[PDB]
Write a protein that binds this ligand. Structure first.
Ligand SMILES: Nc1ncnc2c1ncn2[C@@H]1O[C@H](COP(=O)(O)OP(=O)(O)O)[C@@H](O)[C@H]1O
Lengths: 256, 373, 191, 100, 195, 132, 48
C-alpha cells in the first residue's frame, strides 16, 4: 500500500554484521530478522535491525524456528528508548527466495499491517545494490491470469541519514567519494554511469532474448507495457537539434 | 434423529451406505466429514428429484447438530435452493440460509450472489444493480479466496446481457478465466463463452487493448475448431492487421450482437490498425502522411480527422496533427500485446541501442586515454 | 534436580472443532495441554512448556515458557479450518525446542493428534529415520476419532523410542471419548 | 454464565484503553519542541536571519515543506532547538487585557 | 465462551499498559519534580493540519512546544505558573499561581475561632444573615434541590462597635470554610488599576 | 595497575548507534554503556553498543536498570552475539572531553564493578561536519 | 547559588521563586526534612 520505501545508510552494515556474527555456527545461509523504522508520508525508512538464528529445510520450505519472545522484548526495549521507531518489515538474506516467506509474513504482520520483505546481500556487491525491498501483493495476478504469490519490488532508494556524514568521512577518509577534483571526478562519474547503463541494458537484452527462446515463464503483461513506451519515445528525432542548432553552442563559444 | 436416519436410508440405491456413514459421523460428532458426505451425495450422479425432502432432511440434521461447516454447507445446499425453483419463496429460502448461517464467511456472500442470480432470472429491476455492486464492495480484505471471486465473476459475466456492464463484464469474465484454470465444464460451452467475450470486445468502446483475450490460447483453442474467423479477427485487433475482407466476414459471421455495431467495428479496427506502425517504428517513420494513413486504414481523407481525434482521445497517438503536409507525430502511452512471437524486432532494436552505446563509450574512451590511462 | 523442557505441537486441523469430546476436541486437547503444563508447574514452577502448530503454519509466539495462560489465550480461536502437516509440525517443534535452553533441561517434544492425516508413508519414514539419526525424543498422544496409532505413527514412535531409547508410548485411543488421565499416566513418570 | 459479564469487561477495557492511548501520545511525543523567533531578515532563498525573542539571531535554513511565501519577513517562526533551523511558522497576537 | 481468552488479554493489557503509564509518568515526573521555567501561555490554538502553546521561560526565552504535549488546555488556560520541562521544554503539570503579592496573604485568617455565643443583642439580624449565608454553606444541597440560588451580597450597615466583624468571622467558623478579610479603607492605591 | 598505549577497536554500527541516540536525546544527556570485551589488557574491542533512556532522576546508576540490562543481555545472547560490559558512553553537550562530577561518580561505580570501565566522552553537538 | 523559597504543596513538593527568576521546584535533599525549611527562607541549591 506504501508508495515507495527509502533505505537509510544506517541499517545495511548492521544487518551485514549481524549476518557475520550469527553465521559462525549457523551455516544455513539464511539469516532472518526484523527491520525497524518509521513510515510517515508514503516514504518508509529503516532505522534499526535485528537478526534471529533461523534454520530451513528444502522440504516444502516449512521447517523453521525463531525466538519470538526475545524479538518482542527487543521491540519493546527499542520502542521504550525511542518511541518513533516501529517494525517496518522483516528481512531475509539469500536473494534466491524460497517459499516459507509467505508463512513468515503471515506470522509477523501482526506487528506491521503492510508487511514487507528485505533482502541484504552480505557477500554480493553486484553493481551497487546493498539490499532490495519486497511488497506482498496476492490480490489476483492479473486480469486474465491464474492465481500466484507475486511478491513485487517496491521502489527503494538509499536515503541520507543525518549526523552519519561525520562518521562515514572519518571511517573511509581514503576514497573521498565526493565531487573533489571536479574534472576527473566527473570523468569517473561518466565512466561508471556508462558502465551501469551498458550492464543493465545488456541484462534487458538478455531477458528479451530468453523470453524469445521461451525457456523461462514470460511476464510480458508488464514487460511490454513498460518497455514499449520506452522504445517508442521519440528521442531519436534530430530536427529539434536543427531548431536548436545553438542549443548551447553559443555558451560553448563564449566559454572558449 | 434415529427415526429420520431410518427413513432416510431409503429413497435411493447406494444411499444407505452413506446414511450409515452419516450415522457414524454424528455418533462420533463429526461435522466436516459429514459435509463431505453431503457433498458426495448431492454431486452423486442423480438429479436430486426429492429436492424438498432432502432439504428437510439436511435442515433437520444441521439443526440438531448445529456445528457443521458453514461455508461448505451453504456451498452444497445452494444447489437444493436453486433446484427448488420458486423465486417468491426462494428469496425467503436465501434469507433462511442467511439466518441459519449469518457469519461473515463465504456463506453470506454466496447467499448474496444467489439473490443476484435470482434477480437476473426474474425481476431484473428490484435489487440487481445493488447486489452486483455490493459483491465487490464486500470482497474487502479477501485477496485470494478465489471461490466467491469466481462466483462474482460468473454472475457479472452473465450480467453482460444487461445495460450496466459490458466492458467490465468482459473484464470479470477474464478474471473468471484466470481464477479457474482447468476446463471443469464442456469445451463447447467454453467456446460459447469465448464467442460472447469476443462479441463483448467488438461491441465495446473502451476496450482498445482489452488484453488477456486477444491471442490467449485458453480462449482461442476453444474455437480453434469452429469459427476460426473469430480467432483471426481478434488477432487483427491485436496486431493491427486490417484484413478488411475477413473482418467484414466477421461482421456478418455471427449476426446477433454484431450487425448493429459493425460500424463500431469499423472505427475500432481503423483505430487499432496504426499501432502496428507505432511500436514497430520507434520514430523511424514519424511522418504519418495521408497516403500512409490510407494504406494503413483504407479510409477516406475527411474521416482521417475524426480517426486521429479519437486516437488522441483514447491514447493511441498523442502527437501533433498537421494538414499542410498531413504529418502526425508519434507518441504512444497505451501499450498492448506486441505479439511475443515477434519479440525479435524489439530485441534487435534493443541490441542495436546496446551496440551504439558501447561503441560510443569505447570511442570516448579512445579519445580519453590521455586522462584515463 | 532433573528439569524438563517440553514443546507441545497441537493438531489444529479442520476437524478439531467437532464436538466428539464435550466442548470440542480442540478444547479437549487444550485441556490436555494445561493439565500437563500444570503437572510440570507443580513439579517446579519454572518448568517451561511451549506451543507449536502444524496447520500449514508454526506458531512460535508462545515460546518455551512456564506460564500457561499464553498457551490458552493463543490456542483459543486458532480457527481450526486448515489441514494437517505432520512432517513439518514435529520438525519445527524440534527446531523451536532446539533454541537457547539449559543443558540440564531434558529436551522432550510432545504431540497431540486428533484427526485423520493424509501424508506419504515414505516421507514420514524418511522423517523418522532423520529424527533417529538426530536423536530426537518425541511422544505422541491421540484424541478422539482417527486411524489412531496408524502404521506411520507407530513406526515414527518406534524409531524415536527404540534402540534403547526413552520408551515413549503412543496410545490407541477409542474414537470420540477418551481418558486423558490414562493417556498421560505413563509418560508423566516413565517416558 | 460468566460470558454475560463480557459487556462489563468490554466497558472496563474501553475505559482504560482511552487512558492507554492518552499515555501513548504522552510518551511517544516526549519532545523538546522548538524555540520561537522572528524573521529578522530573509537574506536569500537558502539562508535566512531568524532572531530569537531574547537576543541572538542566526543565519539558518528553512523547513523543507515550508516555502518563502509561507515564511515571509517579520513573521513569528520556530527554530530547531539544537540544529537551529526553521521548523514551523506561527501567528502572533497582542492583548491590551485592560477594560476589555 | 471467548470471555476466557478475552479477559486473559484484557487483564494483561490493562496491567502492562498501566505499568507503561507509570514508567512514562515517572520519567516525566522527575522532570516534573524539576520544573524551572515559568509558563506565560501565549495560547495559539494550532489545530494539526489541535492546540499549541508559547511559553516564556524564566531565563527569558520562548518555547513552542507542540499541541501541549502533556496537559489539556481545558485546565491549562492562558496564564502563568504551570510546570514546564527544563529539558523537554514542554508543559509538565499545573501548579498554584501567584496571588498578586498583597493578596497572597493580605490579612487572610486560615480559620476563625470566635463563637456565635459571645456576640448578641441583634439576634434577629444575626439569625437572618445566618439563614442567608451559613445555611447556603452547610445546607447548600437544600438550596440546590429547592431550585433557588441563595443570594450572596449581604451588607451590614450600622455604627462601629455593633459586632459586624465578629459576626462575620463567627459565621465563617460555623461554615467551617475559608474566610478572607478585605481592608477596605486601604484599597485606595495610587497605582493605576491596583485596587 | 597496568595501562599501556591502549587502543579501542570501535565498530561502525556502534558509532551509528551513538550518533542516533545522541541525535534523539540531544538536550537530555542520554546515557548508555559500551558493550566491549577485554580480549587482553590493552587491545580492547567494542563490536556493539546499545541505547538506554536516561531516567528522570538524571545521571544515576539506577537509571541504567539492572533487570532491564540483564534482560537485554539475555536477548543479545539468544539472538545476535553476546558481549561483555567493560565501558560506557554518554552524549555530552555541556562541555568537552572531560566528565562532570556525577559522571565521575558513576564511572567510579562502574570501575568498581568492572576491571577498567573506560570513561568515554562523545559530544553530540560539537560533532557537526568532520570532527567527532 | 542560594535563593529564597516561595511556598509548597501539602507536603512533598515546594513551589519556589528563585533569584535566577526560575519557577523552581525540587525534591528537598534527603538530609533535609521539610519541617526545617520554611517559606521565605534562603536555601542553597546544588547545580546538578
Ligand atoms: N455583640 C457583641 N458581643 C461581643 N462583643 C462585641 C459585640 N459587638 C461589638 N463587640 C466588640 O466590638 C469590637 C468590634 O468592633 P467593630 O467590628 O469595629 O464594630 P462594627 O462591626 O460595628 O464596625 C470587638 O472587639 C468586640 O469586642
Amino acid at each position: 500500500a506504501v508508495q515507495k520505501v527509502v533505505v537509510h545508510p544506517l541499517v545495511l552494515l548492521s544487518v551485514v554484521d549481524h549476518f557475520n556474527r550469527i553465521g559462525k555456527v549457523g551455516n544455513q545461509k539464511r539469516v532472518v530478522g526484523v527491520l525497524l523504522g518509521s513510515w510517515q508520508k508514503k516514504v518508509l525508512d529503516v532505522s534499526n535491525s535485528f537478526a534471529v538464528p533461523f534454520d530451513e529445510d528444502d522440504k516444502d520450505d516449512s521447517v523453521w524456528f525463531l525466538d519470538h519472545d526475545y524479538l518482542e522484548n527487543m521491540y519493546g526495549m527499542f520502542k521504550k528508548v525511542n518511541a518513533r521507531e516501529r517494525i517496518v518489515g522483516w528481512y531475509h538474506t539469500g536473494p534466491k527466495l524460497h517459499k516459507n516467506d509467505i508463512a513468515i509474513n503471515e506470522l509477523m504482520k501482526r506487528y506491521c499491517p503492510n508487511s514487507v520483505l528485505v533482502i541484504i546481500d552480505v557477500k554480493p556487491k553486484d553493481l551497487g545494490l546493498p539490499t532490495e525491498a519486497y511488497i506482498s501483493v496476492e490480490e489476483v495476478h492479473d486480469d486474465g491470469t491464474p492465481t500466484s504469490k507475486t511478491f513485487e519490488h517496491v521502489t527503494s532508494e538509499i536515503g541520507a541519514e543525518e549526523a552519519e556524514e561525520v562518521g562515514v568521512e572519518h571511517l573511509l577518509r581514503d576514497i573521498k567519494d565526493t565531487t573533489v577534483g571536479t574534472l576527473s571526478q566527473r570523468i569517473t562519474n561518466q565512466v561508471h554511469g556508462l558502465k551501469g547503463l551498458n550492464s543493465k541494458l545488456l541484462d534487458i537484452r538478455s531477458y528479451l532474448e530468453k523470453v524469445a527462446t521461451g525457456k523461462l515463464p514470460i511476464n510480458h503483461q508488464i514487460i511490454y507495457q513498460l518497455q514499449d513506451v520506452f522504445n517508442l519515445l521519440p528521442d531519436v528525432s534530430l530536427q529539434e537539434f536543427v531548431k536548436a542548432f545553438y542549443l548551447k553552442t553559443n555558451d560553448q563559444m563564449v566559454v572558449v | 434423529v434415529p427415526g429420520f436416519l431410518q427413513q432416510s436410508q431409503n429413497s435411493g440405491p447406494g444411499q444407505p451406505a452413506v446414511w450409515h456413514r452419516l450415522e457414524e459421523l454424528y455418533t462420533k460428532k463429526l461435522w466436516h466429514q459429514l459435509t463431505l458426505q453431503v457433498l458426495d451425495f448431492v454431486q452423486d450422479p442423480c438429479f436430486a428429484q426429492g429436492d424438498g425432502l432432502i432439504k428437510l432432511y439436511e435442515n433437520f440434521i444441521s439443526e440438531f447438530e448445529h456445528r457443521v461447516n458453514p461455508l461448505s454447507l451453504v456451498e452444497i445446499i445452494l444447489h437444493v435452493v436453486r433446484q427448488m425453483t420458486d423465486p417468491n419463496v426462494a428469496l425467503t429460502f436465501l434469507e433462511k440460509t442467511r439466518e441459519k448461517v449469518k457469519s461473515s464467511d463465504e456463506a453470506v456472500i454466496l447467499c448474496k450472489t444467489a439473490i443476484g442470480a435470482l434477480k437476473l432470472n426474474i425481476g431484473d429491476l428490484q435489487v440487481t444493480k445493488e447486489t452486483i455492486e455490493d459483491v465487490e464492495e464486500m470482497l474487502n480484505n479477501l485477496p485470494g479466496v478465489t471461490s466467491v471471486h469466481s462466483r462474482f465473476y460468473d454472475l457479472s459475466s452473465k450480467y453482460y446481457q444487461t445495460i450496466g456492464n459490458h466492458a467490465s463484464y468482459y473484464k470479470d469474465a477474464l478474471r473468471f478465466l484466470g481464477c479457474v484454470d482447468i476446463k471443469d465444464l464442456p469445451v463447447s460451452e467454453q467456446q460459447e463463452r469465448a464467442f460472447t467475450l469476443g462479441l463483448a470486445g467488438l461491441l465495446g468502446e473502451g476496450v482498445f487493448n482489452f488484453g488477456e483475450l486477444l491471442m490467449h490460447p485458453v480462449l482461442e483453442s476453444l474455437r480453434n475448431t469452429d469459427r476460426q474467423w473469430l480467432i483471426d479477427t481478434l488477432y487483427a485487433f491485436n496486431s493491427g492487421n486490417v484484413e478488411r475482407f475477413q473482418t467484414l466476414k466477421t461482421a456478418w459471421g455471427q449476426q446477433p450482437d454484431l450487425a448493429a455495431n459493425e460500424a463500431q467495428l469499423l472505427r475500432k479496427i481503423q483505430l487499432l490498425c496504426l499501432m502496428e506502425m507505432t511500436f514497430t517504428r520507434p520514430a523511424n517513420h514519424r511522418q504519418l502522411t495521408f497516403e500512409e494513413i490510407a494504406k494503413s486504414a483504407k479510409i477516406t481523407v475527411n474521416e482521417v480527422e475524426l480517426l486521429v481525434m479519437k486516437a488522441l482521445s483514447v491514447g493511441l497517438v498523442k502527437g501533433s496533427i498537421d494538414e499542410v503536409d498531413k504529418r502526425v507525430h508519434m507518441t504512444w502511452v497505451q501499450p498492448r500485446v506486441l505479439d511475443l512471437q515477434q519479440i525479435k524486432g524489439m530485441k534487435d532494436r534493443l541490441e542495436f541501442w546496446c551496440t551504439d552505446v558501447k561503441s560510443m563509450e569505447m570511442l570516448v574512451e579512445h579519445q580519453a586515454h590521455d586522462i584515463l590511462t | 534436580m532433573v528439569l524438563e523442557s517440553t514443546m507441545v505441537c497441537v493438531d489444529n486441523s479442520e476437524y478439531m472443532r467437532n464436538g466428539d469430546f464435550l466442548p470440542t476436541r480442540l478444547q479437549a486437547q487444550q485441556d490436555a495441554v494445561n493439565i500437563v503444563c500444570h503437572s510440570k508447574t507443580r513439579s517446579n514452577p519454572e518448568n517451561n512448556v511451549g506451543l507449536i502448530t502444524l496447520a500449514n503454519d508454526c506458531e512460535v509466539l508462545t515460546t518455551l515458557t512456564p506460564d500457561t495462560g499464553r498457551i490458552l489465550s493463543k490456542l483459543h480461536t486458532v480457527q481450526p479450518k486448515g489441514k494437517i502437516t505432520f512432517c513439518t509440525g514435529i520438525r519445527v517443534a524440534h527446531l523451536a525446542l532446539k533454541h537457547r535452553q539449559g543443558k540440564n533441561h531434558k529436551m522432550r517434544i510432545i504431540a497431540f493428534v486428533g484427526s485423520p492425516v493424509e501424508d506419504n508413508e515414505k516421507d514420514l519414514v524418511k522423517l523418522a529415520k532423520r529424527l533417529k539419526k538426530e536423536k530426537v525424543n518425541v511422544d505422541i498422544i491421540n484424541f478422539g476419532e482417527e486411524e489412531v496409532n496408524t502404521e506411520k505413527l507407530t513406526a515414527f514412535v518406534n524409531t524415536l523410542n527404540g534402540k534403547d531409547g526413552t520408551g515413549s508410548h503412543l496410545v490407541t485411543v477409542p474414537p470420540g471419548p477418551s481418558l486423558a488421565d490414562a493417556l498421560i499416566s505413563s509418560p508423566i513418570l516413565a517416558g | 454464565i460468566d460470558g454475560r459479564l463480557k459487556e462489563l469487561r468490554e466497558q472496563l477495557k474501553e475505559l482504560t484503553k482511552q487512558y492507554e492511548k492518552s499515555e501513548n501520545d504522552l510518551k511517544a511525543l516526549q519532545s523538546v519542541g522548538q524555540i520561537v523567533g522572528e524573521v529578522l531578515k530573509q537574506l536569500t532563498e537558502e539562508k535566512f536571519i531568524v532572531k530569537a525573542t531574547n537576543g541572538p539571531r542566526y543565519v539558518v535554513g528553512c523547513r523543507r515543506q515550508l516555502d518563502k511565501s509561507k515564511l515571509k519577513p517579520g513573521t513569528r517562526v520556530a527554530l530547531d532547538m539544537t540544529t537551529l533551523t526553521i521548523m514551523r511558522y506561527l501567528p502572533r497576537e497582542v492583548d491590551p487585557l485592560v477594560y476589555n | 465462551k471467548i470471555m476466557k481468552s478475552e479477559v486473559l488479554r484484557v487483564t494483561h493489557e490493562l496491567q502492562a499498559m498501566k505499568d507503561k503509564i507509570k514508567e512514562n509518568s515517572e520519567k516525566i515526573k522527575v522532570n516534573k519534580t524539576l520544573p524551572y521555567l515559568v509558563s506565560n501561555v501565549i495560547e495559539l490554538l494550532d489545530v494539526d493540519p489541535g492546540k499549541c502553546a508559547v511559553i516564556k521561560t524564566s531565563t527569558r526565552q520562548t518555547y513552542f512546544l507542540p499541541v501541549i504535549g502533556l496537559v489539556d488546555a481545558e485546565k491549562l488556560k492562558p496564564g502563568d505558573l504551570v510546570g514546564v520541562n527544563k529539558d523537554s521544554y514542554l508543559i509538565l503539570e499545573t501548579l498554584p499561581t501567584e496571588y498578586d503579592s498583597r493578596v497572597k496573604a493580605m490579612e487572610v485568617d486560615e480559620r476563625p475561632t470566635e463563637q456565635y455565643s459571645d456576640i448578641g443583642g441583634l439576634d434577629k439580624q444575626i439569625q437572618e444573615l445566618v439563614e442567608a449565608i451559613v445555611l447556603p454553606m452547610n445546607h447548600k444541597e437544600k438550596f440546590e434541590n429547592l431550585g433557588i440560588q441563595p443570594p450572596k451580597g449581604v451588607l451590614m450597615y450600622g455604627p462601629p462597635g455593633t459586632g459586624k466583624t465578629l459576626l462575620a468571622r463567627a459565621c465563617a467558623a460555623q461554615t467551617k470554610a475559608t474566610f478572607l478579610k478585605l481592608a477596605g479603607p486601604q484599597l485606595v492605591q495610587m497605582f493605576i488599576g491596583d485596587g | 595497575a597496568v595501562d599501556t598505549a591502549e587502543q579501542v577497536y570501535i565498530s561502525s554500527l556502534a558509532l551509528l548507534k551513538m550518533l542516533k541516540h545522541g541525535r534523539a536525546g540531544v538536550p537530555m544527556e542520554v546515557m548508555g554503556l559500551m558493550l566491549g570485551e577485554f580480549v587482553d589488557d590493552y587491545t580492547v574491542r567494542v563490536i556493539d553498543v546499545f541505547a538506554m533512556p536516561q531516567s528522570g532522576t538524571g545521571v544515576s546508576v539506577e537509571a541504567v536498570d539492572p533487570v532491564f540490562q540483564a534482560k537485554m543481555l539475555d536477548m543479545l545472547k539468544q539472538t545476535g552475539r553476546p558481549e561483555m560490559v567493560v565501558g560506557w558512553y554518554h552524549s555530552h553537550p555541556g562541555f568537552g572531553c572531560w566528565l562532570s562530577g556525577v559522571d565521575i561518580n558513576t564511572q567510579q561505580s562502574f570501575e568498581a564493578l568492572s576491571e577498567r570501565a573506560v570513561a568515554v566522552v562523545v559530544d553530540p553537538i560539537q560533532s557537526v561536519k568532520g570532527k567527532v | 547559588c542560594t535563593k529564597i523559597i516561595n511556598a509548597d504543596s501539602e507536603d512533598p513538593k515546594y513551589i519556589i521563586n528563585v533569584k535566577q527568576f526560575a519557577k523552581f521546584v525540587v525534591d528537598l535533599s534527603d538530609q533535609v526534612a521539610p519541617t526545617d525549611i520554611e517559606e521565605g527562607m534562603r536555601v542553597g541549591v546544588d547545580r546538578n
